[PDB]
């Protein structure tokens, strides 16, 4: 009888952890502690020291992605925020100092003898919460986190999580990763709530009466005009095979009524001036049966997108890892703290049935800065007699691997492969996680590259697909949230993608660099 | 209408890989290669050089478990066997040499720079089949195996697998791990067949007509008297809650019609003179819904037992690891090559529903020679409102871990804990897997100990069970297959187990070192 309301398509709900745009490595506390200390505090202090440097940096597109505050006009509120959160920072530096002590002062004292004494000397922040052992040489001690006891600790604190609602008025997004997530304008609403909260599911599922929205707003502890603003984000609430390239590395599929979404990133709608025919949140089906993530890079598992869709998701598939290290924290446990309750980790070449499809994980090597990170896979999906490979940014640095893989998995019809063949220094993503820096020129040799032409070619030659699509190029303007979009057919990447398309056509098959949305047969 | 036959209860079917009694570390080829080279070849050559040393060693019980051939009388056949398998050995040393080359000559050349060149230089045995990366210091290169491509390689060879049938005429078993598995007597039958073969399931399931046994025997490539001997191993084929300690660390449970078996080791029957009231293969239910293995030690996952029961098993639970190293090869993949088709790996404090029970994995630290081995867990089973902890040989070397664990899991009613508080040097299990030995006195500090009294006490104090049972003591005589059974209440272990039982009673609860079979309430 009563009117029902749902979240507007043009309102974004941005994830925030400890004051910053939320992504994987900010959830576990030991990795948060490293980022806060080695990066975020340095960004605030630098900024507070001379806001004009940042202002001046932000003024040039080519500096976008550096350690700059973009809301540089808001010095007072940023300072007030930094000042207020100083106790969060001191609690968290306890953990930072504990890991330093373990790595620098405790582990190096031992040289092959029983490691029992170490446990007796642990800092309290880590007592009961780590395991130590020797590496392959039997003499150099190392450790790993007992991940769930870390999340149970005082240092993982849900009260430091928030979302920020705001309108979306264009396709393009400003780089967000280095700016505190404050209520910078009155169109914005910053709300304290855990990212896993069923309250956010209520929000995204919608279909609420007006008095139900008020109840919800009260459960968020909103009153007054803030509740009114909240209410204003809502509006009256308005079957066979598909293969839909939606953007970057994100692909949607349907097969005999089972739905799939790989490497999810979606754009918004309801505002004038954006590009036509984009696949947005409004275009999603009711249920996403299988959500597949290839690896733990920002551009392939976007928190903002994951939360907006959580309520529709059945099962999440992801790469398996037990490293339980600062460079390679447990991905399934991250997704579970985001509130995904049915997450399955898949090892190399394991197979899982999904609806009428079969999924197989494929070895993914490279693009991780030669770090010890196990959390990465390609996904092969067999949809009946048609098989599709999502390779994401996986490389072909290991000659023959794909030949050996083909011998086991058989033929593949279609391949999606990414060709960001020149990428970031591995330290611009991972550097705050190091114990210390590498010498600058050495570091510079460690980069996050996808396949170049030759590599991509050998992949194709080895698997013999009829269709090849290059993808994951960070061209869509909404990807700017997380990376520096700036195209031009000089860029070696574009050249190489072209060479590859060439190559595949010459050999008598279809190929194309996908750029915006594309329907495909399957 | 026709008579049906089943395998006798007093015929053992012993697993064999590459001529040796089969256990986990002989299945993956890279680990097999290390054992063949660093141990098994040395045992044969030593023996062939002076059979009397071994004869003389074997004559003394206290030397049992050392590197001795027990079938020392059979020099000719052993030599003939060694001679014939020499090509298996040369193929496998190719792999051994490849890993040496990778570890000693390739990885150490690099010091922080991109590792791409390494892939170009790999020995052919490892091309396409490893991933290299840096450790935590960013400068010391390391690697891991791409496990499934190793099993696809020529170096994993099912044709080198066999079983050996033989009568069991007493409770006690001779130590088997260091004697080639040859047809030493006419009561014995050695048959070439993969350990995963459905042929063995046919054997163990039984219910075959006499002409069906002949078909089976033909499928094993048996004829003549060997087929007749095979036939002779068969004989005419002859509902609510339980908790049954069956032996060593092995426990059986039923709960609302769901069946469970932890750390499976069973004894045989059908021969006179054995102990009364043992729980043997004949005592198993039709289906084992859930098979749980705490860790990858010989005494907790006995191939011989696992194969005899495979056909009855639903699902196997095991600890999760991605290390994919020689010290810590993938356990789920080992079980899958044994032919278990539904294996699930569980991380620390993850929960899984099993029938009407819930299972939770618990952190297991220690007893692994401070090696980097992730493949180990305790299992908590919640059977309705009653909860049982199987700790196996897990220790309490990390003070507070159990307190922190209790905070998450809540109360536990019953605990099984193992108190082999003085155990083997870690090198007597793992030493052939090392790249090189440790200095002798250092090595001697690395041992495989379970909890002693104080440790075991703090575990109990932290979890507050009403019932405590010490278990995993290697007392049952059939455990001699795999360890040196030799009891006496001097042994510090027995003292400490006693102290613990004491402690628990004093605090007003039940406790006992279980010794042979015991029914229990649940
Ligand atoms: Fe990536
Ligand atoms: Fe990417
Ligand atoms: Fe053990
Ligand atoms: Fe044991
Ligand atoms: K917490
Ligand atoms: K299929
Ligand atoms: K093979
Ligand atoms: K229960
Ligand atoms: O990525
Ligand atoms: O063990």
UniProtKB/Swiss-Prot annotation, chains A, B:
GO biological process, one term: antibiotic biosynthetic process
Keywords, in A-Z order: Antibiotic biosynthesis, Iron, Metal-binding, Oxidoreductase
Reported effect, residue 420 to A: Decrease in activity. Interacts strongly with the diiron cluster
Pfam families hit by this protein: CmlA_N, Lactamase_B_2
EC number: 1.14.99.65
Catalysed reactions, semicolon-separated: 4-amino-L-phenylalanyl-[peptidyl-carrier protein] + AH2 + O2 = (2R)-2-(4-aminophenyl)-L-seryl-[peptidyl-carrier protein] + A + H2O
Functional note: Involved in chloramphenicol biosynthesis. Catalyzes the beta-hydroxylation of 4-amino-L-phenylalanine (L-PAPA) covalently bound to CmlP to form L-p-aminophenylserine.
Family from the record: Belongs to the metallo-beta-lactamase superfamily.
Protein name, per record: 4-amino-L-phenylalanyl-[CmlP-peptidyl-carrier-protein] 3-hydroxylase
Organismal lineage: Bacteria, Bacillati, Actinomycetota, Actinomycetes, Kitasatosporales
